[PDB]
Design a protein around this ligand. Sequence first.
Ligand code: HEM
Ligand code: HEM
Lengths: 725, 726
Amino acid sequence: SLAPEDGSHRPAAEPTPPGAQPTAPGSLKAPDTRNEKLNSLEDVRKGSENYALTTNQGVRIADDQNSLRAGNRGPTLLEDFILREKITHFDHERIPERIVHARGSAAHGYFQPYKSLSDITKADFLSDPNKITPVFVRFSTVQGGAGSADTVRDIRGFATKFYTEEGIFDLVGNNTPIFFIQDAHKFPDFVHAVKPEPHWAIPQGQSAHDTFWDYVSLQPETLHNVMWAMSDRGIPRSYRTMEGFGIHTFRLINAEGKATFVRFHWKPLAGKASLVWDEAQKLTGRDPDFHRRELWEAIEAGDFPEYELGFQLIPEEDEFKFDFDLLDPTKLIPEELVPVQRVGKMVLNRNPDNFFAENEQAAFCPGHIVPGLDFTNDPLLQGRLFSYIDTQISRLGGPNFHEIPINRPTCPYHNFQRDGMHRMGIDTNPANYEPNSINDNWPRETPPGPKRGGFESYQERVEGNKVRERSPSFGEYYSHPRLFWLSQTPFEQRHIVDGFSFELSKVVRPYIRERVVDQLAHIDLTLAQAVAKNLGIELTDDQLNITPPPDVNSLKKDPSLSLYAIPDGDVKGRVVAILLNDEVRSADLLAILKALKAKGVHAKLLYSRMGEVTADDGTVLPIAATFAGAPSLTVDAVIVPCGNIADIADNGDANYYLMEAYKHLKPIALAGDARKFKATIKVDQGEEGIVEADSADGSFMDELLTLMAAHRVWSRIPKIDKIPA
Amino acid sequence: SLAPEDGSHRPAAEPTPPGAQPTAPGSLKAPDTRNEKLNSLEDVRKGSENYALTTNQGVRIADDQNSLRAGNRGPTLLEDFILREKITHFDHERIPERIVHARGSAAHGYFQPYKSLSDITKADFLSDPNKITPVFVRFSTVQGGAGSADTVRDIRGFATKFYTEEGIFDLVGNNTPIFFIQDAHKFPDFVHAVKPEPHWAIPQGQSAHDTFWDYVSLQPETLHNVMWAMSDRGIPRSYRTMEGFGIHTFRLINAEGKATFVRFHWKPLAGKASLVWDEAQKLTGRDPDFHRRELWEAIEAGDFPEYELGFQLIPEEDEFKFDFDLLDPTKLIPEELVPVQRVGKMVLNRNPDNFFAENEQAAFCPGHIVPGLDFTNDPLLQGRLFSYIDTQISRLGGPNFHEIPINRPTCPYHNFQRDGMHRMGIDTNPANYEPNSINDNWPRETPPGPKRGGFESYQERVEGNKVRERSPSFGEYYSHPRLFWLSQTPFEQRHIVDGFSFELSKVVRPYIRERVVDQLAHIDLTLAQAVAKNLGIELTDDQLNITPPPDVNSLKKDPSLSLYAIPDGDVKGRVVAILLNDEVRSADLLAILKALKAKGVHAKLLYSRMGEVTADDGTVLPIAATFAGAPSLTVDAVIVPCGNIADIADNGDANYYLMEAYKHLKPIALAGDARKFKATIKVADQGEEGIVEADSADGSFMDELLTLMAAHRVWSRIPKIDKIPA
Ligand code: HEM
Ligand code: HEM
């Protein structure tokens, strides 16, 4: 009898925009949204409604408020089995977090290819355009714990579990196309350096400390993935607005046994967008769950995250054609030399029911491949194949982690494997070995073949001695950092300079700072000088004379490496803050919202207090948040309609919201008297990125939506140093 | 060699101010700080200098950069035993974090009593003023994960491990004197409610979501601890600047067998200080490891955290002489009815060497008591006794967690317990059971005695029927929250109203907000009216007519419940930001620093870039951090000296630096042309209380600034920050 009579506790099982309703588990939120993986999970879902509360043994509980005691004011009794089971289960809730990418957010989806790829690979999931494969995707950061913030400067993980007809395929990618290290053997050294320092366990979610920059300074192979990290790539606006990459070269194998080299790409259909550092660092304070929240809400809204799977393809005879080793994971393949051809579409359309059961327990391993794919001798990748199965024995508590429901294949699985902790499968097979006659040798081996064949490795030639030795072909470190750098817009280049500058400023030992700078002189002198000047370091004459590295196969730049050089903006799923007053002009707010709804743009209505305001025309407006409660940090744009502006004109928080939005390069739109706010951000004829008009004209809504399509107002950067926000 | 020639890589083994040197494991940083427990760990401490790099089996590694592979562009081989060992170890580094109080920072220290307490207890470690007991202290939040932020709004844990001669005593406490719930049976319900919500695991380190307040609204026993939480107690300035409480009534037992009732207190020598919320929420962004870092750095500097252990003592016959029940842990004992007798002093004086080894693996339990102490029937505490041992099994991977070194007793430990995962002790006893004749029954039972006796429970009379039932004497929920609210300052009350309003602001279902407000009308109408207004709620005529709850044993208020009502200010260990310019007035700096050193106040010098600047008298000043890099959030005060003020006058980061500190009520001092900054903070020519100003910083200027800091924050300023866009 505790629920409200108006039924305001329950959300609607309808797509609703962010903040409209309580968020719910996905099967309640969207019961009609289905795929084969999600239908297969019905057998393990527990309901709640109209159920007696029980122990795990099915015994109904009379009193869930009290321990059993020898009297009212008595001591608690050992015999209280209901108390102890409840506490015992609570005391054992936690399991070890992932050693890396502990922080992650996940959703169910489906994948479909555009056309049969059966010419280049015999993988069943790429075999036909009508073949629809369920996926589960987890996006993550890298350094921080499960309880760390989302919008840190870090790499992001992009791992995809394809539940195919011929097995699970895990594509375990990152949001940059390279990694920091060449050889798996040094993964703990590099991960120990970026991680919090072992004496005092500081700092969390930050590469900005001494041990990371010490390692980078002594291992220049790192410098290419560090540039990406120090770029706006390091702080994305959303998981929906970043690129995914496989990073390693892998193989495709077709029915003839012909092997094609591949690199995997995810391209975001919503386009690439990133935060700026001041905004990102502050947002870890205002909303540490910002990416996790944004993603759940985009999906509850129907703003389904969409990505296009892309292949970079290289014939086997083309292995040595480039200036870099294809097996080197610190080098990218420029899109200018090898294009991405579109392979398929992935759509994330449903949230999970239980984060711990589905996200936290989900296990990806890049070793999970299917017939039609295969590895290469990329010596980072070779090392990963051992690690992902080893870690699950402790993290998921045994070798039966595949029987945990999220991890189960939809396709059939039968073998002679037996027992292990938390064994779920009860095998009826008389034989637990092959060859056997007592079960006629079932289940049986399948020979390799074009469809439904057994897995067989590509018969790659191996010649050479047993050595622990780095290929000399890997021993070039500066030319790809340089290609990346020259491919960036000038405003991206300052953001990179500022990232290096900020992080190095945090480094306590100055010699570590000086060595990182000396490494930068080897990539480009302009970038190297701009950092030295922010650190009060002066380049020597030797440093000034360092010859630039070769370009990569004759390229001066590649613009596919920039987030913004070629615009790809889509406003659908973006959010505007609307700053109300106590007597809002109804005409302005009516026009504003119908323009946003038309382009799938969301709004939140903000005031100095919660509850309701009334517009000039009597309309009751409910309030989503306070100006302090949902700061500018959390929106793409700000719109102030006309009304009793006097009401908010001297409001400290209302003026700061405009200044915070303005400093962070966001579009700002002012109608009527709202223009008087132009004084707080020191703007009168007006400027690019401030939309102003007598009323929210509809041309006014067109100017604002056009700016939102370009994501930020880069022209504004020269003005923001003056503004104290 | 990879190290610099100059030796700038190694910190000095002598105390230094924060930022002066790189931080170090405590045994490198302070090798001559010792106690019996730090000396006991010497057997497991592992050096690194001048040693061969080896496998765990002690095989020397020749090449630590490469997998073994067939050809230098070849596949990795299974037979590489060195790579697999390194990867495996890495692949298995994490253990589960604690279910609650996962986020924490800890340190070694000692405890000494002021005088022999054998009159009221036979606890050996309280027996003698010369008895020095080593400790390990862990401070924590409650809700957040091990990787969540320090300065969130939350309860803080204050756990103390005493290594006594008669066994380990863990006093496991929180920074408020009550808890949210009465019976341990509902702990999982309350924790599930305050924790991130199960569908999407949002939000981290916050109680500002629907399920916590849904529970608060439907369970009014919660309201007293919610009041402390919504107050500035929820956002302390430092672990050094908060109080500690055991919460439960415990028993002291003396040699004669007399039981005395006790509640435990930790009184901070550095005094009580707290953040403001806007400042604290932002610090979780700018520096989420702020409490952890400050603790480590205070100790590296020599500003030791110090606390006074205090007892509230109730003789057994007074058990019913309060109009609240002593065994209810949502109820507090007012220091006005029962004063805290300061009984001893604890000092935290050494950082650990390895955070995982000592902090993360440290296990505390309220069941770990020693002869001279006993329990009560407090039903929250009764439940705790089961849980602390139970999680330790999964979290530290078996029943041998006491053999993890930081957990080990310094006193002798011998029993018939055998085996278990990772058993370290090799037992030579021919017997693994008693009674035995084969070892002559060693080891042996000890009869209870005044000193070095066996533990025997206090023979408390039990009369009742087996019931799952809540004492009706527990069912009064508003009178302690009222006593707390009346005991606060007007600015403290404003901050509580703001705490409730901001958090209920983030509650999505308005009926939950209406419901929490209805509860506040049962506590106090003024507080209920101010929260409803901030939420656009109108109290009904009914809500307006709700009778206030009665006084607690007729106290009108208790100023011990307030952080600021009585000044306890100590500025030793605080920090000042000094905002530099490219030609600083040396006269201003020379006075600013001389006065801070004298009071033990730290300074970090700040500029628009790193490196150095030169003073007008030719002094080279090293820059500690940028304005952006060390925001106002991280300092107690800001002083701006004279020099070339034009250099930073148009600097947005520098103006905003002063605007943030002003909004957060911090003291600001401006000398000479620095006064030109008064305009950014909208201070008039006439000046205002809380802005120190003079044409040079001569003596009166610093005495004015340091006086403001003793008062911690400028409360008079709260009406003037409405009109600052910061
Ligand atoms: C290009 C290089 C790498 C990429 C792109 C990569 C990618 C990822 C991703 C996306 C995850 C998170 C999966 C999830 O969300 O659950 C992850 C986790 C992990 N990675 Fe990597 N990784 C790389 C290199 C390595 C290496 C060299 C090692 C060790 C040899 C390693 C060991 C692990 C482990 C232990 C986890 C946690 C495993 C688990 O509990 O499931 N990774 N990696
Ligand atoms: C007044 C009430 C309570 C206080 C003051 C309190 C205090 C604490 C503190 C300070 C810690 C952290 C210890 C550390 O740093 O290692 C802790 C941990 C814990 N508490 Fe509580 N607690 C209370 C109630 C409860 C209750 C009722 C339960 C369970 C029924 C409980 C279960 C736990 C558990 C399981 C841990 C984790 C311990 C570990 O993993 O080592 N607590 N508590």
